[model samples]
Target: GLIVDTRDVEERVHVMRKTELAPTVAHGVFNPEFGPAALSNKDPRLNEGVVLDEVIFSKHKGDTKMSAEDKALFRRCAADYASRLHSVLGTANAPLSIYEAIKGVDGLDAMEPDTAPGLPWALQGKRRGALIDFENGTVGPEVEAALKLMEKREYKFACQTFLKDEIRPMEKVRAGKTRIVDVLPVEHILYTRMMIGRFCAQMHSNNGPQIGSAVGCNPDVDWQRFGTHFAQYRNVWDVDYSAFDANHCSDAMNIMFEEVFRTEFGFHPNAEWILKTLVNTEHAYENKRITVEGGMPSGCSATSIINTILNNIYVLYALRRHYEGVELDTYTMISYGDDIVVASDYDLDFEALKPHFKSLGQTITPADKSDKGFVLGHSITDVTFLKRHFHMDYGTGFYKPVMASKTLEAILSFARRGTIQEKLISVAGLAVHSGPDEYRRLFEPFQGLFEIPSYRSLYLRWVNAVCGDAAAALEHHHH
Candidate 1:
């Protein structure tokens, strides 16, 4: 079942070309003549054609009206952002132009092989053969044993339960609405295979750290290192971007793979093939509605891997070039997709690095530059040496434990479904062994609140108590 051929790269290129030129639902449905430009009235193409007045001016009919002054300000800001974006990523009409730029870059085809890290087990061609062998009853005893352990309980149960279940035809959920996403049984199988690959890679080596997994590399270590280096500097800024997934176009991906990854990093030929095959091919929208353009869709197994690698390489190249004289420890730079954090004792002129980032078809959003704290995970925001440790605020005036709110919400939500003691133990366990002094101070106030009988009562009491007293205490004390 493993299809290996010399035409893999050529076939991928063809697919890329097809996807690039294909008219999207947004462009085609809204205004076919103007193409993608109709989505934004900023383009000159909008002036050349009959405008969809109903769709275009529908905003003006709303209760909230913008005055001429605010509207003019909006245009000025929009124009500035658009100009910067175009300068970096070229015109919006030519999404595939980045690929052409990548192709024109010389010496990508002539790299020495096997210089970079070898392909992980899941990506290897042999892994596919193993899966096929197991299915066909041709697997050896050793492989059979491995498969027994590897086949997760959920996968087995889901297969048995949903095998004959009705095929819930895909439904299109428009933007800003929640809809149930149905994945085929085949999709589940593919997802499991990719998960197994990730598991094997994570368990066997420090591949996660090398690949920039949050768990693989300690956040504490990164925080400590960042503090030590940039302690003297007052403005230790965290940079983020808007629409990172959209900006990471296929052309940029190809350039990263061909020019940077293959040439400089020297990835194995087989590894390169496997990466491209998984990333480029097998992408489809639910119900055959539309094609995914440029970057990998958010949910794919390889999305994180590909995004992390490409971003790392781009940032590394930029850092080396821009900060040539400064001592740059590449490991100190951490990135999970578009969430990039890099620090130095000297202030980083982000404006200087924008051109380099733009060349890769990426943009640095203005909003991120204004924020001081760097978001590491859901609850952890590193604001220099302040050490502010708390969970996400649920707008209940009290921040829960760093990793406790979601689980607590789930347990409390289903309290009626489970035993009373079980619920008590689960809720109590969250704050039982509080780690940080700040967490302890925050948790102490809510200790008596959970003793309330009803789940709803307990929730309300805790929220009120924390909001009334704890909120004030937190303000007075830094620690």
Candidate 2:
């Protein structure tokens, strides 16, 4: 009598039952909805009838010698199964199904949790309240309850609870000042916080469109090509196109706003152009000097980053316009070299400010010679001096002439009416320091605060958008 080892057969059966030789397990599995012909069980001799046989064989001996064509066919089968399994496991199918089966109706939240007496403990009245926290500043009861669980080392419950309130603040941040910070750095502290966060978020939000769509601001350069060309800083080379421009503009805008906002609160006006110019371009200016003296990479001196870095300068001009509208005169403080001073009679809005003392958690540092005087305490003063000594071009040595156009005409016409038109000032005001170069350094301090995995994506998007499609446009020779 032949001894039949049922154990071997059972183990094989178990693997077949577990993995099921399912379409999802294969890479290119077909779907009736998608690849109709591939998934059709029309012929028993073909792949369809072999499913059970293949599953049985796979469990006994691993099938590795699959031909490319067979592998491709299997992929479709596998993908379809995978997608089906995902739907079964994920919220798309489970949430509504669970809600309806338990409650006997939809929109469970509409009915108070108290009314759902018949539900299981997981779906009980109290359990439902554990999910949502809607208040702005106050922690939700649901989250609060979850925090209690954390105190008892119920980390899983604590995490789920914390995620509830997290949405509101993040959303609020997006609605309020994310855009401003994206465009400009405020103070070293606020600017740093906002910059890292916004940069990360922008990358999260726009990275897909940047890489997949292949659309960028500069039509002349293609990122895929230039990316390989500029391989040294290749990872960060392709900055977010729109955000880069916005960042530069924001640097300028922050400067302007710092000066303007401070002036509105009766801070004394200081030197405007020189100080700001110094702060803006301090690092770059120093780098320029060092490069001319052959101290650093020649490519770093004239790098495309310099052009994009100059976005701060453009932002400054925009800041000037904002002051012009408020009927405030903007200038540089001669006394404090780097301060971009503004003269305004308006009082500061202390009530509007919710000073987060936590915002000042970082220890302040003293300035070094390399700092070009843009350190924390008297950084603005340092900026003023640098701008005074440097003779950089300041947009034709005049504020950009405001174009009297249809948009302006419509705006003024709308203003004439008593109805208030809500306008979103999209740009950050100038950094109250000087030089795009100095602003760059001031901006740099905040760089680490918001740094995240997403910054890579953000930088890539900026590079594609600003540089364009042509590889030659980002020539290292130019850098």
Candidate 3:
């Protein structure tokens, strides 16, 4: 017989394996005795989490050298092009807005919550002012209306919002500077309405736009489906455009978002309330209120949707000038967050995109107008998408999706450590993604594990489980 103890290091994997790995029954998982008293919750934190570092932030601050007039003209053009595209998506008039999004939000259960802490139901009582905003939160009609906007049941789930400057540490002694992000008092309430609205829009709102070729958050689109299409192409120019901020130009984003929301929402009075708090950075940070200036709250969605549309539009705008045939046939465009791959027949010059890209927000812009050109962020071959790498197999004539070296290394670490189930699942994931050759290579060291009859069957099952899902769903894109 074999054991599948998920806890033990060696026994979890080997036929035979720990230090006091006992049941977490009568005692706390962490130590106690010395203090031997009840736990305390006195230090209640209202503030919560992602400040972008200056190194990263400074990179996206659009062409610093552009004259003032150019900024003015470029801003207008980007807005207009957004306007033009707005009509294409069926939001020409202001039909959708945040108001309808909340109005249509059926209930709190309709939307899902994230891992972070959400507002405590008990805390939504009389002392609600304390939890609402630090030094307590409120403002004119906007904030007032956002408060009124929530339905009765929703209040129990929502939490406060705060801003914090944090630098996540890693072993490499990563960059020292801090980036500014919200304290993620974590949303159950504020995030709810937005999510429900996004859901509604995704299901019912597709009179659609071409720029929506890929968006992880928007309605029906999935980045993975688009990822498959990218690998399908041979001449792929893998791109990582400078991720711009909604903080820098919430106006451009709002200009588009209002219409974006409008396209699906239709007219409703409280729509601006979503913008009032959600789009503006008027939250409690560092235990006090600071308008931290730029907008784009972290949780729920919006920011990614806008960024997705913006980048897609810029790409389309550039290609339209150089080519005349149906874009879908000649060039392929796929994106997930800031990562996009534009595969084409010829060397696609992305020069026309600079002004539009610059006009939007902070991005790597050309130092001078007379400058030779600016390249898209990480415009190179042999691409990367999330953890997968597109290694061009010239003989096979397709871009193969292989596991990143870093992930493969992690897989080995997983294989050597943890339960047999853990090791098999971990290695199988890497092996399956990379293909048969790697399965053999990675499993060679653990060939004995496979020699065990029961374990071998389970290992193969796990591999199939991991491999079949991605392969089937991606291939299903054909229909």
Candidate 4:
């Protein structure tokens, strides 16, 4: 049912513009054989799994980017990262070095660090020290009370009183570790708790601020039914002028030490880490002695990250603005971190919150006075669909219209038979097995794999699986 003039790049661009293929075109080019079918889902979890497998498995022996040995190395590294995450979250012992922690996972001892080696910036450097202090009896009453609640397994109460606004279950301390006597105080514990609580609250909490609830819908709204007609509705028709404007989006993102301190362990966070990376530098040709450099991911797509974050922000704002009207501004804040993006808003009315942001801790301030004029247009369309439809039904769940899934599958099946898939699979396997040096060899191949037409679609599915449910991943790839 789809027709494309494969020879016309401009035509391709035009079609991509209308579709969601713009982001894919900008970052990962299409593989001539595969096309751009994989990148279609705005929700990453419902994308194709076969495409991802092809890319990952392509790094096997005989590919130009890596040898079989290289893939083994890369696999080791991936295994290492997975393993480290398991142990760190499971053991409750936050190792000083994430790279060292990677060794705790089985079958990852040989992995060369794929990206960088360090704790996320939100948990790095000075911030790490601050969080550690809270863990090792260095924090105040509010923080200690929060930690005590966490120890007592009173997550909901702890989240409401001590933590930030959002939390997720995956970020929690493994049940096994939570009961261990020797578990040390680490920021990871708090961070894990905060993330778990926030995510869980947002999606599953009975009275939590859901997509529809933000815009005045009943607290117990049914997401599935709302999704069918979300795009056609309008949530915010009369946005109040006093609360939100251009200035708020910018200033609302400022630092909050108390929020971070008290809730880092118990609260849930609405925002996610949009970017976090490290880069190494060295002097060549005798210009200077060899030196290793470390930093964020190089040339990371900041625009995509920002746009995605803003998209979520705008959707959230739309929902709340419609329902609460003016009061929406009082509840939330958003910030982009060095390696993480933060979306948080506090209820200052809560009595327990006062001590957390007291004289010595964190605080929030009004929007900056010296900002550009604010725009005042109701985002009726954006608010209605994004919250009720997109966030609740699509963003949160992997389920999609059957037609959409079939369309994606057709594109992937076409690419499977192409030489591009064969070559990329070979390279990925090698990358998985290789060491750092082998990774360097596989870099070009790695880049090539992303060019596959089905690349974006496939990767999205993998990201979705990790971010969504297990069945969704299986459906996207297997069906």
lDDT, candidate 4, 263-375, per-residue tens: 23333222122111011212111111122222111122222222222223333333332334423233322112111111223322222322222211122221212233212
Choose the strongest candidate by TM-score.
3
* Each prediction's TM-score versus the true structure: 0.41, 0.16, 0.52, 0.24
Worst 10 residues of 2 by lDDT: 157-166
Scored against the true structure, residue 284 in model 3 reaches a CA lDDT of: 33
Top-down lDDT ranking: 3, 1, 4, 2
Candidate-wise lDDT, in order = 0.34, 0.22, 0.39, 0.25
Per-model root-mean-square deviation over C-alphas: 19.1, 30.0, 14.4, 23.2
Question: Which regions of candidate 2 are displaced past 4 Å?
Answer: 1-122, 125-130, 135-138, 156-464, 467-479
Error at 325, model 1, angstroms: 5.2
Q: RMSD, model 1, all Cα superposed?
A: 19.1
Q: List model 2 lDDT by residue over 1-479, tens digit each.
A: 01112121111101111111122211122111211111112322234234422221121211123345533433332333223322332312111122222222221122233221111222233433343221222234444554344334332310000001111122222222111101110111111111122222222222111112111112112222322222222111011112222122223323333432233332222212212321222111101110011011111111122222122222223233233332112211111111112111233221121121011111111222343321122221122111121222232221111211222222222111222212111100122113344334323422453322232333344344434442235455743
Worst 10 residues of 4 by lDDT: 158-167
The residue ranges of model 3 lying beyond 4 angstroms of the native Cα positions read 1-114, 117-173, 177-211, 216-235, 246-248, 263-276, 283-290, 316-332, 344-347, 351-356, 364-381, 391-400, 410-427, 440-479
Off by over 4 Å in 4: 1-225, 228-252, 255-325, 328-479
Q: Residue-wise lDDT of candidate 1 within 331-445, one digit each (tens)?
A: 3444556665454445556567776666545666433344543322211234311112233344542343334333333223322322444555455434332233433443333
